[PDB]
Amino acid sequence: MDDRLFRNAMGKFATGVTVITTELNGAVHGMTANAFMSVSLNPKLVLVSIGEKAKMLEKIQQSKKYAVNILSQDQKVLSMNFAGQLEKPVDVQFEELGGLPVIKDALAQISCQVVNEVQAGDHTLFIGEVTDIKITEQDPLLFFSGKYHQLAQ
Amino acid sequence: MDDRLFRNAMGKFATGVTVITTELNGAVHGMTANAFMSVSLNPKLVLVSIGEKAKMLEKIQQSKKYAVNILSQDQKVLSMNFAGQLEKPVDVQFEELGGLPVIKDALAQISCQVVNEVQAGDHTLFIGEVTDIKITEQDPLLFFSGKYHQLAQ
Ligand SMILES: Cc1cc2nc3c(=O)[nH]c(=O)nc-3n(C[C@H](O)[C@H](O)[C@H](O)COP(=O)(O)OP(=O)(O)OC[C@H]3O[C@@H](n4cnc5c(N)ncnc54)[C@H](O)[C@@H]3O)c2cc1C
Ligand SMILES: Cc1cc2nc3c(=O)[nH]c(=O)nc-3n(C[C@H](O)[C@H](O)[C@H](O)COP(=O)(O)OP(=O)(O)OC[C@H]3O[C@@H](n4cnc5c(N)ncnc54)[C@H](O)[C@@H]3O)c2cc1C
């Protein structure tokens, strides 16, 4: 079994789409991620998985904090932006939550403090304790089988 | 910030739906989970998150293996079954992959050997190296905001 078969399989697990944001000495950094998960209720924990070659990795290692911005159906362009897939950057509207930069109009905003780091092969798991949450009732951007998708209404 | 607000926020992250299966001395055990994630390409790693009160936790601890069965759109009843939501268990059709019981007609089947265990609050993360994969081109069962859903076609 090859890399292609593995990736194809992994893409059969449908997800939402997030942008992970953090702040390092004034500068806001973001990265598109769907490797995100709810972890624990007591205490309130979440986890994101970041590739070893992602610039975001060292950013979070330093800041020890991140926010997860769950993207609405209307935010596909943001997903592409923070995935490095547009030739031209976009001017993103940021607001603030729990001392973290968050994306305006996100489906949901979840601010976290890093409480654990676990290397796992290719990637590092950043376990975050949630300090602040903001929610809206928007429909979600989905990702499945290598494509963007929507919920059936 | 309540428990309710946290759970509501977590539900804002849409996912596919899996059944985690394992075998322990003849007996097949299954558990519905959406806290699943692709972790690493080299080596090929995956992760599932199991609640400390789940019977499945000790099952995996002992067998040191699990399969992830991604559920198709037609398998909502299976999801409810393995979530302890049916009064009487249905008779599930199992087949075999990499020495693990897997669910027939699943959207995808991914067999794993446990290579790490990480407690994280409420839950334990079982990191699994993938040995075998089977994929189909079915549409996925989705879970979002506490309800089952489908992709827009
Ligand atoms: C849907 C999908 C899911 C993905 N999931 C994951 C995953 O879970 N884990 C993982 O490691 N990778 C994931 N990726 C890949 C990842 O998003 C890209 O590899 C990303 O470009 C890597 O970011 P970086 O940290 O290396 O920095 P970069 O490659 O530079 O970051 C990407 C982009 O973010 C932009 N950006 C950063 N800050 C700002 C800002 N302040 N204002 C405007 N633009 C800004 C930059 O302009 C850049 O183009 C996913 C990609 C897709 C499309
Ligand atoms: C969509 C959704 C996502 C979920 N995600 C997670 C998650 O990621 N992590 C988590 O810990 N919990 C999750 N749960 C909750 C979890 O599925 C239930 O709490 C589950 O009942 C706990 O299983 P158990 O191991 O404690 O054993 P049980 O409570 O006994 O297992 C559940 C059911 O599986 C059935 N079953 C087991 N083996 C077989 C078999 N061989 N043939 C037929 N039936 C069988 C049993 O009859 C039982 O009814 C989720 C639930 C839902 C609905």
Half-sphere exposure of A44 (CA within 13 A, CB side): 18
CA distance to partner chain A, nearest, from residue B86 (Å): 24
DSSP A84: T
Residue type, A91: D
SS (H, E, C) chain B: CCHHHHHHHHHCCCECCEEEEEEECCEEEEEEECCEEEEECCCCEEEEEEECCCHHHHHHHHHCEEEEEECECCCHHHHHHCCCCCCCCCCCCEEEECCEEEECCCCEEEEEEEEEEEEECCEEEEEEEEEEEEECCCCECEEECCEEECECC
CA angle B32, B35, B39 (to 5 degrees): 125
Q: Which two tokens stand for residue B4?
A: 């309710």
Q: Which residues line ligand 2 (CB under 6 A)?
A: B 17, 28-35, 49-51, 54-56, 79, 81-84, 89, 92, 143
d(CA B62, CA B42): 26
User: Taking the alpha carbons of A72, A78, A79, A82 in that order, is the dihedral positive or negative?
Assistant: negative
Residue type, B123: H
* A37 contacts on B by Cβ (under 8 Å): 13, 35-37, 49
Three-state DSSP at A91 gives coil
Q: Give the ligand at the shortest distance from the Cα of B34.
A: 2
d(CA A127, CA A115): 6
CA of A117 to the centre of ligand 2 (A): 28
Domain map (residue ranges) of chain A? 2-153
Task: Count Cβ atoms below 10 Å from residue B19 Cβ, excluding itself.
Answer: 23
Do the Cβ atoms of A120 and B41 come within 8 Å? no
Domain A2-153, CATH homologous superfamily name and number: Electron Transport, Fmn-binding Protein; Chain A (2.30.110.10)
Only one residue has tokens 């994101």, namely A48
Return the residue of B nearest to A8 by Cα.
B135
CA of A84 to the centre of ligand 1 (A): 5
d(CA A6, CA B146): 29
d(CA A96, CA A104): 9
Q: B1, B3, B5, B13: which to substitute to probe chain A, counting the most A Cβ within 10 Å?
A: B13
Compute φ and ψ for B58, nearest 5 degrees.
-65, -35
Q: Is B28 annotated as a binding residue?
A: yes
DSSP B17: -
Q: What are residue A30's DSSP bridge partners?
A: A21
d(CA B2, CA A105): 22
